[PDB]
Amino acid sequence: SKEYGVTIGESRIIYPLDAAGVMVSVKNTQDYPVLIQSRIYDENKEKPFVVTPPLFRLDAKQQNSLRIAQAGGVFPRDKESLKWLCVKGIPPDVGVFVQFAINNCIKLLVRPNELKGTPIQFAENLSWKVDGGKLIAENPSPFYMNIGELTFGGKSIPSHYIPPKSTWAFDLARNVSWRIINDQGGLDRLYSKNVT
């Protein structure tokens, strides 16, 4: 059987607005060498921040780091902005031959120094209502609320982030239970409220 794997050393990057750059480690967990290709996308995953090196070889079982650097750019100062860092590991009768590659993407959260505190301080501040046949979260904080666990009426809802000062609509009971993911990639404590 064929084996693939790419490990990023963190699961999100908190990029302090206007910082020179941040380092993130990349690990080739496989028995073979790979090309590591790193790309940044906008919040819509359409193709400001620079990744160095944009492409480089990583030997078997080896670990290296990327530098993510902000060069220029203007962002809001009243809220986080979101990009994505994608790290792709590029490996070296009808018969079928399929080759795969893992593209491992994590959130790059651009955080103004003007914002006070962190998401876990505000995680309880989400409110909920049902409207249009959907569960609707409202996020009054300036932080992306990256839900990692969501339950409505005891049923699992697949998570999604709630953008700052905005809403998200989940598909489909009074009680909503949620946990956000903290800056370090850990699942935070459980909160509950009934829908309005």
Partner: peptide, 27 residues
């Protein structure tokens, strides 16, 4: 102390049986 969770992603591919063409030429 800052304790971090990395983003680990693995993939295993296990081949199935070879594909045989039927007598009408379809798979």
């Amino acid at each position: 102390v800052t304790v971090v969770e990395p983003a680990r992603i693995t993939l295993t591919y296990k081949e199935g049986a070879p594909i045989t063409i039927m007598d009408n030429g379809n798979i």
